[PDB]
């Protein structure tokens, strides 16, 4: 599907109604298939990190790690398709400018890409940001075939903000999925029993972004 209709038919009014939403076989199986082999080999030629610290026991041999990450600019050797996911990523934003929110978004991170071992592992709830840096947009990419949470667990449950209910969202493979970054969604990743791989990437408002540089005051100007 053109990033054109998929963005003003459904992602507009969803984002702007629910404020999270999913778009299913983003790419193809083909595109998703290619994906997914550049962040197995980026894996498993060691280029993620061991993981976040979860149990620091006293005897580090047995110290538990849990979801391991790996940023990505898109043009690093053999991460051509990952590039090409992001900039369809890009390519979507860049087709809802002005229709999201009231948000004016002109620059994105790298891509964080995650792979949670399968070890029992999740991530606790949190909010992506919470304290105004910027981020407005969390998007988020899913290359897990065949993924059965019933029996590896991994769902992304999400906790939108006045509502009685939370929104459980699988890491389906060729998923895409958009969300607002502050408040309003608090989420965490339920323990996952296999691997697990996503990469997100989040888009930065202009004018969030902009004032959030004076929090961090980041490079001056020399004067004597
Ligand atoms: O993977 C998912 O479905 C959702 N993941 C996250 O919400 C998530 N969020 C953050 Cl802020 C981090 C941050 C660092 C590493 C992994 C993260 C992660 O998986
Ligand atoms: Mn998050």
Known sequence: LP?????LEYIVPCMNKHGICV???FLGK???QQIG????????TGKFTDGQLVSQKSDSSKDIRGDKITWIEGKEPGCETIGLLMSSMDDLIRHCNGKLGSYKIKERTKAMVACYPGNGTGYVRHVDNPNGDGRCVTCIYY???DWDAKVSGGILRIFPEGKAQFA??????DRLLFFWSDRRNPHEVQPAYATRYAITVWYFDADERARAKVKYLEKGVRVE
């Open 23 to 25: 778009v299913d076989d």
């Open 168 to 173: 459980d969202i699988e890491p389906k493979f």
């Open 3 to 7: 990033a054109l209709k998929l963005a």
């Open 143 to 145: 290359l897990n075939k």
């Open 30 to 32: 083909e595109t998703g």
């Open 37 to 44: 082999d550049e962040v197995r080999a980026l894996h498993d």
